[PDB]
Amino acid sequence: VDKRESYTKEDLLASGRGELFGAKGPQLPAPNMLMMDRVVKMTETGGNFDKGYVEAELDINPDLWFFGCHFIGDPVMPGCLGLDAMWQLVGFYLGWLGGEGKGRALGVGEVKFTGQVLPTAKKVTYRIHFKRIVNRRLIMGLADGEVLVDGRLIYTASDLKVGLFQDTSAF
Amino acid sequence: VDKRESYTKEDLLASGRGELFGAKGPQLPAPNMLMMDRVVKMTETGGNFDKGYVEAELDINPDLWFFGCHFIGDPVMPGCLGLDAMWQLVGFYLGWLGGEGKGRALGVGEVKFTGQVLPTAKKVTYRIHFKRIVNRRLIMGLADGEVLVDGRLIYTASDLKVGLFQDTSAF
């Protein structure tokens, strides 16, 4: 895969279609499960553990689908979706490294939500710090993640774990 | 509130509008974020810790929205949504006990996905085992959860934490 340092909305839409990393690489979900608008920085070193880093962003506007149903009369972005954006990124990175197989979130250690994303926010930032990568014949990625809303750290997640599966029926 | 041990799809939809437990109580998300069709059993005792139990179900069909976008050509229910259903149920139980305020998931201890829900499955079962409730000036619920697909355990979550906030400015 020709690694780029950044990807645009159109690159992420292609990803979901299987065009970015090709037919044997992982895919990101398509709207409305896609939780990022852009990947601004990807590096194989750096990050808190110096073993990789990814930063992505989601632009907030009052019309985003999830605000209307969550909750009626009390709009707030579901923390589960911000968490999913982090699993989505770990899987995207494994494919960026050239890993083959479809992505599947395997788990996460501690997750703490200390604030919320309201429809008046402007931007959500996702920062992923890779701890361990097993790109052997068993691709797995381990990482810590952070979610910031307009620069304020609101969610942390330790040990996000994602694996790539050549044959998904074995899951 | 008048406690019942089971609720229908209709009750759950009324809950999305605050019409089940009243305006002062918490709400469940409305479609498409509502992740269960019915609550089959709720008890104040029972469960693995004899401190509360909740069993709910989600009927599966190939047409559920999330199969189409997650992923294209590889339909699988997002584990993040199964996880959210567990947070939704803890908040619902807190309201059922007569709690007042809006629900906000505060976190989870450890999550493990060891299986997946495909469009060929028929039913997802959620089991929540309460371990501690704080229904004072501070209302929080701590529980362990399990997700089963067609009777087989696929996800587990320890220490799901949810709080009811009277003033969401405290977040």
If you write DSSP's letter for every residue of B3-24 in order, what string do you get?
--S-B-HHHHHHHHTT-SS-TT
Nearest C-alpha in B relative to A76: B104
C-alpha–C-alpha distance, residues A32 and A49, integer Å: 32
C-alpha distances out from residue B55 to A48, B33, B47, B147, Å: 41, 18, 10, 10
Instruction: Write down all domains in chain A, each with its CATH number in brackets.
Output: 1-171 (3.10.129.10)
Name the phi and psi angles at B61, rounded to 5. -145, 155
Resolution of the determined structure in angstroms stands at 2.0
Q: Are B53 and B46 in contact (CB under 8 A)?
A: yes
Q: Which residues, including other chains, have CB under 8 Å from residue B143's CB and lie 6 or more apart?
A: B52, B86, B90, B128, B129, B130, B131, B159, B160
DSSP class of residue A24 equals T
Query: Nearest Cα to B56, choosing from B24, B18, B87?
Result: B87
> Distance between terminal CA atoms of chain B?
26
Residue B27: its chain A contacts at CB < 8 A? 71-74
Burial label, A3 (beta-carbon count in 10 A; 0-12, 13-18, 19+): exposed
Burial label, B24 (beta-carbon count in 10 A; 0-12, 13-18, 19+): middle
User: In the PDB record, what is the listed experimental method?
Assistant: X-ray
Residue B78: CA count within 13 A, CB half-sphere: 31
C-alpha–C-alpha distance, residues B134 and B132, integer Å: 7
Residue B76: its chain A contacts at CB < 8 A? 104, 168
The active-site residue, picked from B70, B104, B131, B161, is B70
Distance between alpha carbon B132 and the CA centroid of its chain, in Å?
Answer: 16
> Distance between terminal CA atoms of chain A?
26
Q: Are strands B152-165 and B139-149 parallel, antiparallel or unpaired?
A: antiparallel
Nearest to B69 among A29, A68, A78 (CB): A29
